[PDB]
Every structure is written in structure tokens, then in C-alpha cells.
């Protein structure tokens, strides 16, 4: 779950996805799916690829959007 990652580990995962730093499209899709499952955010992959106007869609931007959404919704945060 997301609480098994530190914020640093989660920023590395998001950066992998945003840069497409994977061996194959299949691997990238698996990573995005895992990201969706960790965040639990209703927008799923749209956080990365179809961000709401005004959201910071850089890797640290997405990490912060996730962090704040989870906080607003009474969900667990990152390890540490």
C-alpha cells in the first residue's frame, strides 16, 4: 500500500512513470496501475496524463496532490 513507501520512494516511482523510464510499454502500464492502486485517487492515471487545470503535473506536483488528497480524505500517508 502507499504507506509502505517513503515519500522519497514514491517520488522515484512517479518520476519513473513521468519520464517513461521503463523497459517496455507493458512495464509502464503495470507501474501506472500500481500507482493508481496506491493513491486510491478517483482520477487514476489522469493525475499524470490529464491533470486538472492549475494542478502541478511535475513529479513533485503529483506527489503533493496525492499527499494532500489522502490527507483531506482521512487516509494513511507515507512511511516516515
Amino acid at each position: 500500500s502507499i504507506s509502505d513507501y517513503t515519500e522519497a520512494e514514491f517520488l522515484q516511482l512517479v518520476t519513473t512513470i513521468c519520464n517513461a523510464d521503463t523497459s517496455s510499454e507493458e512495464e509502464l502500464v503495470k507501474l501506472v496501475t500500481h500507482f493508481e492502486e496506491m493513491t486510491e485517487h478517483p482520477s487514476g492515471s489522469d493525475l499524470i496524463y490529464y491533470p486538472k487545470e492549475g494542478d502541478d503535473d511535475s513529479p513533485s506536483g503529483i506527489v503533493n496532490t496525492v499527499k494532500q488528497w489522502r490527507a483531506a480524505n482521512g487516509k494513511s500517508g507515507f512511511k516516515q
Binding site: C18, E25, S45, D57
Partner: protein
């Protein structure tokens, strides 16, 4: 039977002029056509398989300033590698999350594999809606 999509072939065909919302069209009607400018880059080239051709289509999208114009930077990183870009969440189906290239006339019914005029770009959702109505 031996699968034609897994054998080499030569890209042919013309595609069609498209605009800025081209990928928006992929979730409507019979999907979007291959853009003419991509057909122009790929026509007469030999591909090892349909999956090789598909990677070339997305590589060409990455190189065309107009066709990649409304991809966001993360989407651009993906297509620059030959990956198909992610559709909006509302157009995904299960683990099918990216735009799909499909044959309009089925290969089994005489449609050609690498004929760019026989290929459509659809979201997973639009493809599935079309298929379930057959």
C-alpha cells in the same frame, strides 16, 4: 492458419488530414484515421510485424509538432519511446489503458495488415463498444 499480423509487410495508404483534437476523435464513431502526415512517413517502409508498425506510428506522432501538441510532457515521454499514450481514465477498459490501433475491415475478411487506410485509432472503450455491437 498462420497469423498475418506477425509476418513482415509493407505499409501502404494515404491516411487523412486531422486536427488538434485528433485523439479526442478516437473515442467516437469508428475512431480516428491514421494522420496523413504519419502515412506519408511510413508509406512504402517494411515492418517486421503489426506491433513494429504500431511502435513506428507512435514514434512518428512524437516527431510531429502538430500531432503531439496536446499531449502533456509525461505523454510525450511515452510516445517518444514508441509507446501508445494513455487515454483518459473514462476511456480505459481494465488493463487496456492506451490508444489502440485496429483494423476496420478484419484481416480474416480480406482487410490488409499494413494498409493505413484500413487502420483506426480507438480508445479501449470505443473499440469494445463497437465490438459488442457486431
Amino acid at each position: 492458419m498462420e497469423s498475418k499480423r506477425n509476418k513482415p509487410g509493407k505499409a501502404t495508404g494515404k491516411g487523412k488530414p486531422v486536427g488538434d483534437k485528433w485523439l479526442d476523435d478516437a473515442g467516437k464513431d469508428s475512431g480516428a484515421p491514421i494522420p496523413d502526415r504519419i502515412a506519408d512517413k511510413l508509406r512504402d517502409k517494411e515492418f517486421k510485424s503489426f506491433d513494429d508498425f504500431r511502435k513506428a506510428v507512435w514514434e512518428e506522432v512524437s516527431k510531429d509538432p502538430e500531432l503531439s501538441k496536446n499531449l502533456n510532457p509525461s505523454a510525450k515521454s511515452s510516445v517518444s519511446k514508441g509507446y501508445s499514450p494513455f487515454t483518459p481514465k473514462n476511456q480505459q477498459v481494465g488493463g487496456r489503458k492506451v490508444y489502440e490501433l485496429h483494423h476496420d475491415k478484419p484481416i480474416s475478411q480480406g482487410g490488409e495488415v499494413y494498409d493505413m487506410d484500413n487502420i483506426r485509432v480507438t480508445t479501449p472503450k470505443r473499440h469494445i463498444d463497437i465490438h459488442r455491437g457486431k
